[PDB]
């Protein structure tokens, strides 16, 4: 806090400021899907892949700039510990053969959402819901587990593109809870060779379902449990007062 | 508003006009279902032709008439511009070779729609949950948008009829969303070369799923904080008086 | 009423009356699921069949009985004009060629609903919630019926398996609507011959998915706000009281 | 209780005690996830199948203390019963040649669950929601079971794979009612040779789902009438006082 500090603090703090990315963002948003096609690329392929480090540098002289506004409160904040992350990963050079960062750019269009504050309120909104749900999913993930554990065990010698490995059965077990061919394409399979499959399946498939029709139930039927006690107790001063 | 005027007003404002609209829709209803059979068009396909623009200009007429009586109103009621759009197209002539246009004279079946006070009710009524999820939305295109453009930078090279383009990878992005043949039609395929593909599949069908229980959940759980502010107010109101 | 007609009363109104009947359906559920057994028919299959028509017989008087003790207050109640219409097919004689009628008998097994009271309570909450969505489900097969026609002439030349014909479209559209293999086993073969085919078929999977979910919560969240105006009257009224 | 009694009773009840067993469960979770692997098993395989009768004994004994300190207490408690069975299992001898056991010894690790009791919280919870489907698991399977006869004796003789039998037909509607490949893979292949075969799954899929849907509704509507009527007690209360 000081004349030059205060200086930088306001353009930093503007609105302009934050509009500027937002257009650079949903400019550079338009670019990354106009740089998707092979036609466009071979005419103006070169005027977006500098537009593109134009907009790094922009949108990392943009985060140096926030990090000296906001000093330690930067890295404590969620949103912005995100677009730190998410331009890091835009600033790794192009030439290094790991073809997942080059497409890690396109993390950036992200920005967004932590730019826009209508976004924000959504993700933490969805965000805000997880923290209970960490108990289920616990329980979920060990009886994944455990059951991916007796299938490779099971059925594994026999079927290992489906179960040969605890990540095959992981995978096959997802795959049957989103219930997605989990009859013609594995069970039934399973079932020339193993006739009792189906008893390992079935309740997995009862017991997986059961988990998530409740967690929901539990969420909505608890979400507003809590509205009741709130307006009873504004109803209950309101009769003593 | 004088004499001549409000002769016409009674007219279309009448009971028998509603009800004589809601009989040839639903008549042309039976009608167009009845185009169906290349059997029938063989006897009796010339009445039913005839029967149409009958039809067509009776509601061309009716919309003339509704549009006297009801002035600058009428084009800014959704009812009645829906009927306004839908007779419009039935009148584009059949000869200009858009297949498109002479099915889309079926879309008139929907006047049944405005016509019925009933069904405009829940028509309403569901539409008026959408203003709401606008912004969720938008982040869930956002979402979709940001994905389909790293799918076809992943994958469309060797599986450019799944996501060969930007578009290619929204309508597989979005099969996967409706978790149709997802693993065994599309991700299983894709691991044979890109072994890791269930990072990017995985995760997208935990977001794109999380977000849409979270709509329904939010919806309803919010649905009811009013009318839970609604009733103490009541009560509040009561025990103060 | 008199002498006769108490005598018969009396044993109709029974708890033994219903117990014998509700032990000759779960006795007769049992032997029809043996008789699925070609094994158990070559042997025991005789004493079956006679076990059969004997509790026809038996179901015949007790539904005689049972008209004379209640009048015409039998062929108001829907309960006991099920057990009427579904014993009069298992009397139809087997001999007729019509395979649907002889499978037809094993209906009388619902009777183990209509004969046990916890069972008919379960079927009259869940037939309770539908007369509220007669609407919704006229304007659901509505927009069935006037998509129908127009995949019939989009699509019904090319593709006559699956949309030859009004029904074969109905059909097809259902099988959609529950998601299943709609893109890999319909339309990604459509949009071989109709590229803009999926223009169709995702805003018929948006609007028909759409529905279904406001459905639900419109059962949720309109079956208590009613709870949340019976729940303030009685705190309005011990408030003034 | 008396000297003896007591100095294993502070033993069993103490927090060392749960976490070393917590911690022995940890441990051989892993123990058993690495036991997976071919590779792993060919190296240290030894190390694990002895920490494996370690882990047996050792629970054998601290199960054998918990029946001393609890007493008949012990076999009324699920809980702990649980561990009993799961145990009793892991003890079997691996040589009797019956697959099903020796896979049967990774339930072991769910007594992660049993252990702790954030686990036992969520399994209480989800449990708990049972006891009041028992009616609808009931009217559904009577329902389920009334058509696998029929099925078995309509479509068995043509497609034995699918309903030769009351339980291949049990296996096929229940697949039908996870909607999985329900019209490609069975109900079209069916109308090649029963073309009303539609008659009979669509109603069978519209009942299924619609009581599934209404079991959800119930459980929240019912859920929370409840809340609805404490609160009125609670705020009727203050009112009179
Ligand atoms: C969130 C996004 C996560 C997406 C990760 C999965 C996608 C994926 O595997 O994409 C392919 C890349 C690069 O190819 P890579 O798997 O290295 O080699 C494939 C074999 N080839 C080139 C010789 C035919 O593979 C990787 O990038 C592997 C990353 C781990
Ligand atoms: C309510 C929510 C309930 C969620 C319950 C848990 C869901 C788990 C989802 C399944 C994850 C999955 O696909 O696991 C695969 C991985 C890696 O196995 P890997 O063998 O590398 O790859 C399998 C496919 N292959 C052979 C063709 C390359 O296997 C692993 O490494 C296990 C990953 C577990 C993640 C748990 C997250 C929660
Ligand atoms: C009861 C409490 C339990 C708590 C502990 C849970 C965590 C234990 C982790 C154990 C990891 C075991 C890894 C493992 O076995 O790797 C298996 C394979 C590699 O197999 P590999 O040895 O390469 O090939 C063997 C030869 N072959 C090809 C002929 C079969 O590679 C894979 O399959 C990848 C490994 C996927 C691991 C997934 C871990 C899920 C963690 C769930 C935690 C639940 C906590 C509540
Ligand atoms: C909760 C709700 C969440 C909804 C999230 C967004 C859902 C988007 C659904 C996917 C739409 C879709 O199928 O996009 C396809 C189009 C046109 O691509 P196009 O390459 O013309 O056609 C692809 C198929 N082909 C090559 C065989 C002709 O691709 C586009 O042009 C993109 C259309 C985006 C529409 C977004 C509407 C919201
Ligand atoms: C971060 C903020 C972002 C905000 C901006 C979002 C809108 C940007 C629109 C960009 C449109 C890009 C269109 C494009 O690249 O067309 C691709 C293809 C045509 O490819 P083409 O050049 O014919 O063929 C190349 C050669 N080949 C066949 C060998 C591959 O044709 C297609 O694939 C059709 C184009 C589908 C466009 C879908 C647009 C979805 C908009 C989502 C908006 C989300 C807002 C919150
Ligand atoms: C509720 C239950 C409704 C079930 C109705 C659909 C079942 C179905 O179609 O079952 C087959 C029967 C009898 O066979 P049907 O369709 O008369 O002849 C098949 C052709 N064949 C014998 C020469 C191979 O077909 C019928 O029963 C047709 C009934 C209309
Ligand atoms: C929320 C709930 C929304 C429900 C909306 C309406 C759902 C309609 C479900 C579809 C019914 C269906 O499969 O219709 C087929 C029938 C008969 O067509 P048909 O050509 O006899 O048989 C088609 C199959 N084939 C050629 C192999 C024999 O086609 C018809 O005859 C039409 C039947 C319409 C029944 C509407 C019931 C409501
Ligand atoms: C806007 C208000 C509308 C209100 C009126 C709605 C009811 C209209 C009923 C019209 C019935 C039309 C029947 C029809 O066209 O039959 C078509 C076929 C028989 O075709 P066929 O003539 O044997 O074969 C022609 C030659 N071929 C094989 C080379 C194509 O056979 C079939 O496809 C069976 C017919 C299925 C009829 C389904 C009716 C659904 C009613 C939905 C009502 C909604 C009310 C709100
Ligand atoms: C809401 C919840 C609603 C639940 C309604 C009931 C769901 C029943 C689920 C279907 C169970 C199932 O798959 O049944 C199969 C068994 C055994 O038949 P089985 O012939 O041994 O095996 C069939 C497969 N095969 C021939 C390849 C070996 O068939 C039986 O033995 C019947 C088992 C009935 C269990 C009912 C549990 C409730
Ligand atoms: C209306 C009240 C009803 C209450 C009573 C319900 C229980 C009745 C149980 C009847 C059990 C019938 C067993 C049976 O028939 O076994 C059939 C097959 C064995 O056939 P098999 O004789 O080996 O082979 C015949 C020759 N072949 C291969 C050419 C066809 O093997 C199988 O398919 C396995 C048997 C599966 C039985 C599933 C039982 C479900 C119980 C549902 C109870 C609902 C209560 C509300
Ligand atoms: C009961 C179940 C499962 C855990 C269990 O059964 N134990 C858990 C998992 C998700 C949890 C809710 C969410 O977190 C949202 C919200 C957060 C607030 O902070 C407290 C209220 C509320 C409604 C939570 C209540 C409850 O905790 C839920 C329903
Ligand atoms: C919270 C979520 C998501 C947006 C977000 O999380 N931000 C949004 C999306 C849909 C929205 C509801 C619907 O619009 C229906 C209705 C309209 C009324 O006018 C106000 C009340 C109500 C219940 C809305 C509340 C809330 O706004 C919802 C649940
Ligand atoms: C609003 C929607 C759709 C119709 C529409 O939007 N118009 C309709 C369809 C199903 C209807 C409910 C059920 O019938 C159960 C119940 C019957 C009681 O009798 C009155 C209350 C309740 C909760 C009904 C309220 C409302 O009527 C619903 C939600
Ligand atoms: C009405 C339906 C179906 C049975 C039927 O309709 N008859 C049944 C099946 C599941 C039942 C609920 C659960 O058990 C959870 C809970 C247990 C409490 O103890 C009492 C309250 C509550 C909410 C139950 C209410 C009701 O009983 C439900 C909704």
């Known amino acids: 806090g000081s004349h030059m500090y205060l200086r930088i603090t306001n353009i930093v703090e503007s609105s302009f400021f934050t509009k500027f990315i937002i257009y650079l963002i949903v400019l550079n948003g338009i670019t990354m899907g106009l740089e ?3 036609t466009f690329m071979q005419s103006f392929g070169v005027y977006t892949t500098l537009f593109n480090q134009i907009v790094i540098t922009i949108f990392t002289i943009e985060i140096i700039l926030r990090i000296y506004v906001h000093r330690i409160s930067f890295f404590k904040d969620p949103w912005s510990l995100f677009d730190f992350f998410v331009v890091a990963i835009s600033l790794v050079p192009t030439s290094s053969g790991f073809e997942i ?8 269009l992200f920005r967004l959402v932590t730019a826009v504050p209508q976004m924000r309120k959504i993700v933490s909104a ?3 819901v997880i923290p209970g749900m960490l108990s289920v999913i616990a329980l979920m993930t060990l ?3 455990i059951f991916a554990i007796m299938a490779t065990q099971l059925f594994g010698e026999r079927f290992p593109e489906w179960f040969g490995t605890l990540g095959e059965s992981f ?13 013609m394409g594995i069970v039934r399979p399973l079932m ?7 008893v390992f399946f079935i309740p997995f498939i009862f017991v997986v379902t059961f988990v998530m029709i409740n967690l929901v139930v539990a969420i909505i039927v608890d979400a507003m449990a809590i509205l009741n006690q709130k307006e009873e107790q504004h109803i209950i001063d309101e009769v003593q007062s």
């Not at 995978?171 to 009859?183: K, P, R």
């Open 192 to 198: 020339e060779v193993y006739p009792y499959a189906w």
């Open 171 to 183: 995978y096959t077990l997802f795959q049957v809870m989103t219930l997605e061919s989990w009859s």
């Open 143 to 145: 009886f994944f587990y």
């Open 126 to 128: 969805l965000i805000s």
């Open 36 to 38: 998707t096609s092979k």
């Open 101 to 108: 960062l080059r497409v890690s750019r396109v993390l950036r």
